[PDB]
Design a protein around this ligand. Structure first.
Ligand SMILES: [Ca+2]
Ligand SMILES: [Ca+2]
Ligand SMILES: [Ca+2]
Ligand SMILES: [Cl-]
Length: 128
């Protein structure tokens, strides 16, 4: 793994300390030959909650094109899921326009879908 990245079970991770809209966050990870983190197991989830703490953080999961997809192509329905109760809920009540198409870890680690343009911290990942 590159410096500033954390290796774990064959994967490399980078944790941002500033916020970007999901699209910008996405492009950022790609420019690093990486992709927004893709969580496929309880241990990987535990591993990420540990480093982000109680902070809303974007992951490589979105339903911007329709169905839920992990930016690396990993299958969603067959894969690990850790949604917060009553989520995803594609809420429109925020008043910003549209529903909610980007997944982020909430403060307790469980996921929530929110407005993609909101600036949150993010995590990049790359496999060995
Ligand atoms: Ca992963
Ligand atoms: Ca949605
Ligand atoms: Ca939501
Ligand atoms: Cl915001």
């Amino acid at each position: 793994c590159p410096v500033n990245w954390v290796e774990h079970e064959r994967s490399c991770y980078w944790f941002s300390r500033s916020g970007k809209a999901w699209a910008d966050a996405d492009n950022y990870c790609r420019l690093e030959d990486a992709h927004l983190v893709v969580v496929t197991s309880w241990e990987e989830q535990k591993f990420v909650q540990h480093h982000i703490g109680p902070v809303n953080t974007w992951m490589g999961l979105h339903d911007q094109n329709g169905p839920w997809k992990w930016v690396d192509g990993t299958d969603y329905e067959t894969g690990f899921k850790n949604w917060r109760p009553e989520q995803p809920d594609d809420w429109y009540g925020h008043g910003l326009g549209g529903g909610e198409d980007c997944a982020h870890f909430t403060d307790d680690g469980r996921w929530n879908d929110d407005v993609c343009q909101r600036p949150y911290r993010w995590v990049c990942e790359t496999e060995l």
